[PDB]
């Protein structure tokens, strides 16, 4: 009766992007916000997502303090009017918010639909009963409040993630209603794999209906791998719901894995028939994989042993603030993969849909974290105050607290995503001390999850393990988890492992080295929480600065590498983020406003430790590489005296996954050096330098301006990689560097264009801080400028006169341009006082 | 004003598939066919394309004779009713036929729109003035006549290619109205390449309008590579047309080439504005490439010297008859590429849109041929009788003959396709003898083409060069061409080259070896036109049979390989086709009905010479291979006596592109043999066997049943390929072999499922001819069965009782199943008397 193309059309039509044509106003009056035909002339017309905090100036007196990036919050309304199409008049309508920060209220046509306090969890409302009859204008108004301090890092404020509308028949698969399981995958993988599917179907009509479900599995961007599999026709009564179940067999599916960069994904297509008529159809993304984790050997994925080469990531995107964007998140995660990262932790809140989808697409394992606090709170306006209050959401179950409801709906949202392998129910929960209350709480939370999904490790991250020998009442909380995350606790691992032989252990937060891109200080010394005025609000890109409780990248990695029972780590952090500028944390009159912890700066530019990790985690067969530091501009006596040794020599270091590196100064060899090859006690091969604490090769080089070139070779002496640093002359030009020749004309895709200050030969000037002004013409929109400097208080957005400016920092920065909905092109031009201007052009059109 | 997605939607909506819901009736009455509300109950309802001849039984008295496959033609009507949508009431409507064989008439609402005699050329009609006002039902009726004999090969009858409807604004780009040129590509290729575009725009309205065109170039399935480039706004008067022109620059485009299997293609998007409103948009496929051809060095593509490794291909697809199908043509051309083919010749008629598009997509050079005759005719009902008659098409220009009009519109259709590099204006034109009439004709035809397109070689194929020394009046015709095709004229090449130093020469038809898959005869001897009753209507798969005027694959290839000034060849033929069963040509009471010339049989199964060519044309780096012949079942004394030498030994031969092959009999070596490496006088490297006439390695093997295994090695002695033949026991089962696990549910995609007769160990029985019956269940449709046997008179289609049956031939055959528009799956089951049945399942759904 119904064609495949009609089914695919219905799937498409079921969900619409509801982001366009909102009006926004800070401190708006409630009565005006919610009422029909309000005067919106003093409101800002815009397309969502929109984080309103990122447009503020930095404020030394901000109640967020510098931990929150010194950007104020407040309260605001957003409103939108819409009519249902005539064909949709009798349909069920659900409105979904992927994240609204925070304490939100949604009104439809003057009536309160719900209050949702959580700032990060997706939530949705069935709004059908609130809509106007006969297709007259409806008004949605959303109140968002960011009362500070509410957060230990930059949160952003408002509707910072997508909003979608689902329009379905009265009989439909409920929100997150699909469950897909493959309980015998490991045994069945070389033949027919039984794929058990379940659909929660809802009849919102006031008549009984005959119900059939029909399923097909297809390769995502591939071909069908099953026929149609139908359930038995049965009655679903008026206002009731039911779970239909079926088993489909897929022959030799490709297994999802982190060991490729385009892992295999599948989609389940569900068709719903009401009295023999096709009324609903949807798809659900999933993949085939299995895993195992033992105390002494750690983790394995589809039978292959691996370690979590992981990063902790906050949700902000630098100059974009909290605004979620598919392309921004893709760039960041792709950059993490290029470093050899295979896992991410969403610290410390539910992920966007974009993050989770990209992780499944790129092959990254995900630990998704529900809570930064329990009932104790960490900041007076955080989620702590809601944690034990009764959930008032109209779909909450009897007795559910906010914590029950939020945790349940997060798990239901993500329970088919193959990237997700762990659910965290908290990070550094001070009150989780093994008292009777915290014991009751941990068991309640574990059970909420296990009542939805038993296939993923329930965990928590805890720093209590780093104090003394690590033992204490908190151990009883850890016994209730499937896996136990240690924050900065390497020193107590051996003792805790002997005490708890059965625990699945990993580092949920590690290292916490602090680094400023292109800035160097006392390479010969490890500096602990060094925040004196002589540091001038910078940390060392040699990677030798770390906080009091942290470790260098080398110390935390070599520990992990050498211990098979510590299953991996999530580095604090993969990228810089706005706020927590430790070691100047909450020194509010200093200029700092963003973090030093990242391996990559907020502008998306790698610090040198990126290449350290790459050298350790990416095999020489996959991507032979070599990387030199520091720069080669040592004219300035003050810069050089902080770096040069007693003989005036610069320590030049190479990270490489090759067998040897030879360093040349102006064409003359300074000597070939060879990594020492070694084995872990369980047989894993690794390389190190001159001793166990050095993963680089090092030369002490007397300074002669020119070119330093590193030649990396395989064991047989063939060159497989090279890197080169050059002494720059004085600034002569701004140069622009496109990442993309073209992007999609969809009003969503965007591109990162780097700007650099270069001398007259085209060498980047590594000390340069020149002010750059930007012009944009054509079919694009400037949406951000950044240079990653922690101590900068420059705007990320346009100046008050509409202009776009940003200094270089150590030679570099980035401008971010978003496409419009019109095909064509845009040209970005950069200017700087007394330097040559430059422009580049990026085309826009079909994806 | 207008978004990219709206532009792409308009492009899509401009052209629709008009193939569904036609009614067909052989010998229908004209008055009933054309009139409104005819009773169609005695008509067959069907979706086009539909070749009605392929459903006939073979007929010994067919006026087609066996050269035409002994399948009758006749005359038939097709009719379809349709209403214009309300939004389309004032639009221009053009109806396009990609091919109707032949002598067609199209009626719209009782009125004759046109008579088009050509059976292969695409044609279209503006039917706007014939349509009903206010959106009442329109009737299209198409009369097709296949009065025989009209053809030297199987033509098919009726509407055997797609029909499309274009619905556009009154102001629009005319049919084939786009020209795209890159005249400085070779010079500009490393920077910005100027892409000159021209659009013929037509104003069919009776008011003047202001006209602007806007262009963008995009990578096909990639991203934009230009912005929007607009023309100056100017008036286009009522009922007039004009040519707009613009230049776009594309930076370093990827060059289209035959040396990869996914060459780079681009699309030009044109937007047309009428009084500032976007009213028309379309795209045109093209690619960037340049070529050169010199008398002494032959052809080069983008600066790389190559030879045409070419095949001649007829339009029929075996059991599909003349029905054109994208998937069938894709399979065939992909199979040609896997053999090392880089060029095709469309013998001897314009190509379908599918052929030309697939050739651009797979990287095959195309010579498209317009005529099998001029004014002389070859068969009484062929095109000869129309060639010099005045074109009556409503869009013909004053004084145009049918030959002018057909040649012009073919060139206009294909002038942007990067695969097309040569236009042929005839093949073996007997009357092109250099008399005054034929001289006038050749110059007229060359000029028709050069008035449209100067970038492609105008050519002809001629066998007059093979008689005597090759000289004669025909030389004067050849002097008028850009390139001269020699049919079977290798023996006179040296003399003709010395006589005409400036000619660009190639073999437009070569070899014409005759072969039956799996049948072997006197391998020690070259057999010339051997058609005695002892041959039992079979030819030798050793490749040693050829027609009187032909050559073996080896003799024609080694000639080409050794002569740089003979630019390549088009083998007669790439695949078998229905009709011309030489050397039993027009011996009408014999059983033969299909050709022996193909390298691949009509069922798509390679003959052994496929692997000969592959061994010569595909590099060992690209695909190391080895291939053994004959089979290893020599029990039957009569079969063996035609093959075994005087000592009873079987000559076993290996084709390979490797350095050496070692043959093993039942695990025991029969000796490693090594190809002799040699060079052409111009330095091209090649391999040969024991002497210059042997491209294989050969062993004379005393027959012991079991396994023969060939191990092919590189120079250093590493194994890079192997092949294996096994003695089969008696038939025990039918086995089915899927090419596809799944296909699209679009009612167009189809799949080839091979069936084989196997013994109880799963070895193919190479002599087996068992009758197989097929059942199909689920979402598919059987559309063909075939086994490639020339002497078979079995149906390709269903039996008169609706059943599907076909014998194996030498162990094998194929069944072809088409998808429907519903997702799901189909199961094909095969049965055979006293053997085990087998089934396979193919899924259908998203592409
Ligand atoms: C007062 C003090 O020094 N407290 C520290 C904590 O700040 C620290 O927690 C870490 O703090 C950083 C920001 O500086 C970030 O929030 C990390 O996620 C968090 O772990 C803790 C680590 O054990 O030590 C305390 O003593
Ligand atoms: C009577 C005779 O033998 N004539 C032959 C031609 O048939 C032949 O032309 C070829 O014929 C084959 C089919 O047998 C096919 O049509 C080829 O395309 C065509 O070239 C011709 C070749 O020179 O020789 C004649 O003498």
Author numbering:
A (entry chain A), B (entry chain A): 137 to 983
What does the paper say about this structure?
BgaA is specific for galactose β-1,4-linked to glucose or GlcNAc [lactose or N-acetyllactosamine (LacNAc) motifs, respectively] found in glycoconjugates. The N-terminal region of BgaA comprising amino acid residues 138–993 has amino acid sequence identity with GH family 2 enzymes. Through detailed structural and functional analyses the molecular basis for the catalytic specificity of BgaA is defined and this activity is demonstrated as critical for the ability of pneumococci to utilize complex N-linked glycans as a carbon source and protect the bacterium from opsonophagocytic killing. Further analyses also revealed the presence of non-catalytic CBMs within the C-terminal region of BgaA that mediate adherence to host cell surface LacNAc and/or lactose.
This polypeptide had five distinct domains, four with immunoglobulin (Ig)-like folds that are arranged to create a nest in which the central (α/β)8-barrel domain III sits. The catalytic site of BgaA resides in a pocket located at the center of domain III and makes a series of direct and water-mediated hydrogen bonds with both residues of the disaccharide while the a-face of the GlcNAc residues lies parallel to Trp685 in a classical carbohydrate ring-aromatic amino acid sidechain interaction. The LacNAc in this complex does not fully engage the catalytic residues: neither Glu564, the acid base, nor Gln645, mutated from the glutamic acid that would normally act as the nucleophile, are appropriately positioned to perform a catalytic function. This “shallow” mode of substrate binding representing an active site loading step is the same as that observed for Escherichia coli LacZ Glu537Gln mutant in complex with lactose. The steric constraints imposed by this architecture legislate against β-1,6-linked GlcNAc, with its longer overall length, and β-1,3-linked GlcNAc, where the 2-acetamido group would clash with the O6-specific pocket in the active site. Indeed, BgaA has insignificant activity on these sugars.
